[PDB]
Amino acid sequence: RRRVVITGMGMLSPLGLDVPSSWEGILAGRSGIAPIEHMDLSAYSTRFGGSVKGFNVEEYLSAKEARKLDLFIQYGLAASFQAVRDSGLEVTDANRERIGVSMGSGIGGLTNIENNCRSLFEQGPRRISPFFVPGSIINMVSGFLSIHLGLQGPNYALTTACTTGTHSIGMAARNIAYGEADVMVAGGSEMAACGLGLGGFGAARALSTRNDEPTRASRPWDRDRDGFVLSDGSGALVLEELEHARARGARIYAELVGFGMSGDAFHMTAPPEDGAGAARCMKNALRDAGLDPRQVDYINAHGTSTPAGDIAEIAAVKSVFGEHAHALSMSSTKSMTGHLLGAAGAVEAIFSVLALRDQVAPPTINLDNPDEGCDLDLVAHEAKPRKIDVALSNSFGFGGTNGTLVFRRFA
Amino acid sequence: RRRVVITGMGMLSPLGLDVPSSWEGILAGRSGIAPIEHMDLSAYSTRFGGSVKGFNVEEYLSAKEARKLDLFIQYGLAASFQAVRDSGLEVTDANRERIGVSMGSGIGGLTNIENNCRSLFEQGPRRISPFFVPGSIINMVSGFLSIHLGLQGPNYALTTACTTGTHSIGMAARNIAYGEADVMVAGGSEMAACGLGLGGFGAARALSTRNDEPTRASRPWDRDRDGFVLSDGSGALVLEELEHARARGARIYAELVGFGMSGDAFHMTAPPEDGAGAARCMKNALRDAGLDPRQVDYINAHGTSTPAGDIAEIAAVKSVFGEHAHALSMSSTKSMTGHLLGAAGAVEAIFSVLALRDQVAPPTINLDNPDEGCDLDLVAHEAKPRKIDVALSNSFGFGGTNGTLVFRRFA
Ligand SMILES: O=C(Nc1cccc(C(=O)O)c1O)c1ccccc1
Ligand SMILES: O=C(Nc1cccc(C(=O)O)c1O)c1ccccc1
Ligand SMILES: [K+]
Ligand SMILES: [K+]
Ligand SMILES: [Mg+2]
Ligand SMILES: [Mg+2]
């Protein structure tokens, strides 16, 4: 098993059109949530969310290449191209077989699907776009990235709702550790803010309806939370074998030392109150990393601002970490970004690596009145400079699908 | 790295509602393709496909449980429950943490998506079903299976178009080899025969339009092929660590010895004419298995009945296998079943294991006039009893995403 490091990163989020802009918002405690302007939601129960603002796909692709592609693919490609540029890696005939891709999505091309269904119902099947299928199916992020950059290694795509970006990064790391690849571009992307998306989640009563104050909507572990905030964007990491990164003089942000999974096997959307599945997942990830719970300094929580979800994670952290639960810092950056679904674990793995780089825990904004038992250091309200040698990122997603990543300062 | 064996299998296909019925059709050279009766396609350019005929979800779930679920989830669960029953494994508090799930889908709940879009456009967002999202998103096969059986191990879902079932099985095997699990239920499911699906693929000109003779439509490597046939169904395998299977006295069908991946990085739907990516994938899988190409007896091809696709695989087999390309037998069971997309690699991994069990290569039906260079033993027309110690199953899917599995008689 070879060591795996992070050498490039890329992002579109509700806080910015790249990583440094996003992270500057994060550390300032800025909200990226606002009334949605890209469509008319006056008929809907939730009318706000986390949108990517001012994205120009022409920075990344020709007009010819871009018109075929759903926004979730456009966003995954943007993050991907940023991460490859940031890495400095040169792709050649000598290494292309050894560079793969694993970009995922929770729901994929819902906008294109809705628009092609309109054509179908109103006009007939021959009005469907000839690019509908390739521009909309989930594995075409990985497909198009590999074609655009000539990447010939392992090529696949995860779809695990809120855990997508976490699993994608973890499994890509396993590719590298196993010797299937030397480099992987991994992460996720999502653009589910169409009528079907907001309508669908609203019908399931999953979303906050705090339409009067959108920036106060996402409030993880706060007694007045009322559901998650739907957000859009992408994240991508360049994962690299350690000897390969060193031989080319790559800048190394951090090491990816552990990856853990479990299933709650409990309920379609609420975890058990004791967070038993989440606990097993975190332990699995710590043990994969060869770390004791006392070695953990920062956790970037799943923390979506849901009743059952948020408290289960508090219970799970207490179970795993014992008295040390009170020494570590845990925060939910979803307090500012909302829930990017398939891209959540990607952008949050980035925020974890950057907490390492900058020695600072990002805040949980809006944490005005912590609920019963929510008495840990949840970094309420403002960023906390502190020693961080080891950072976790948790994703405890729809269906009870759990993943945890463990990153460490590189030495 | 621990050894991984196959101890149970399950399926819905166009040939049958379980594995033995399907396989009996396969060995008889029966076509499962017919005009579609479940919806009116008189407005469409392709009006036939491979449908699951006479499925009764009540054999598997209560009416309450089933009404929430898209057919692709119903089908994945059916195959899954069959495979667990076939395995004989008892799930307990002692082993549940060690049993996981990886069921995938290429497109997922397209029928539910279309129906909820109608409600949206005609009536408004509050008419969307409250079960739309959990009953339609791809990871809910794995989610619902884990909740129904209490499976607490690794829980995730692949989405890689035609390669989905292959990757799902391969990666699940890696879980077991790595020690993340002792048992995985793996495979895929698909029900893309709605208006959006047939319309979408027809707009992309991907489908045969041989409406006058549907059973003659799917004709891999035949000079008069004109596109793939869309088919529905599911497959699932119970994968198990070898010591665990032996300790309980499990019946072992075969061993899963290798798994390989690559990306063509060439084109959104056509592979390169020389099948260079497919060759690398097969070599990767053989090398993972510690096998020489001369040890291969049977290949269950990708062979979807497309111009570019089918010939690339012939070129790739010649490249990898040299003169031995003429000694092995290769067939495309899609000649009878059509292309089950995300379920293709699952049902075809099953057919590969059964070729091992029964010492017989299934036929490529309709192979009347083999195209230029298609001069291998493609098992044209009728089944061929022969020695088979090692069987490959290939999936060379949309975006250039390739996967190969290697199974061997167990000793
Ligand atoms: O498209 C970008 N970069 C890019 C695209 C394809 C390949 C590379 C590469 O370095 O190999 C790249 O940097 C890009 C555009 C805007 C901001 C950052 C990266
Ligand atoms: O539902 C089936 N079986 C089933 C469902 C849930 C658990 C088990 C089990 O053995 O643990 C099972 O066999 C079933 C139904 C028809 C045909 C084959 C299996
Ligand atoms: K997280
Ligand atoms: K196959
Ligand atoms: Mg560059
Ligand atoms: Mg049983």
Numbering used by the authors:
A (entry chain A), B (entry chain A): 3 to 413
What does the paper say about this structure?
A potential target for antibiotic drug discovery is β-ketoacyl-(acyl-carrier-protein) synthase II (FabF), which is one of the essential elongation condensing enzymes of fatty-acid biosynthesis, a highly conserved metabolic pathway among key microbial pathogens. During fatty-acid elongation the acyl-carrier protein (ACP) substrate transfers a fatty acid to the S atom of the catalytic cysteine of FabF. FabF requires a catalytic triad, which in the P. aeruginosa enzyme (PaFabF) comprises Cys164, His304 and His341. An unusual feature is a completely buried potassium-binding site that was identified in all three structures.
The compounds were also subjected to co-crystallization trials with the wild type and the PaFabF-C164Q mutant and gave only a single success. A new crystal form (PaFabF–compound 1) in space group P43212 resulted and the structure was determined to 1.67 Å resolution. A single subunit is present in the asymmetric unit and a crystallographic twofold axis of symmetry generates the dimer observed in all other FabF structures. Unexpectedly, the potential ligand did not occupy the active site, but difference density was clearly visible on the surface of the enzyme near two symmetry-related molecules. Adjacent to the divalent cation-binding site, the hydroxybenzoic acid moiety makes van der Waals interactions with Phe83, Val86 and Val151 on one side of the ring and with Arg128 and Arg129 of a symmetry mate on the other. The benzoylamino segment is stacked between Tyr62 and Arg87 from one subunit. As the binding site is located at a crystallographic interface it appears that it is a crystallographic artefact, and binding of the compound in aqueous solution cannot be concluded from this crystal structure. The compound 1–Mg2+ ion pair selectively binds into and perhaps contributes to the formation of a stable binding site on the surface of the enzyme distant from the active site, from which it is likely to be occluded by steric hindrance.
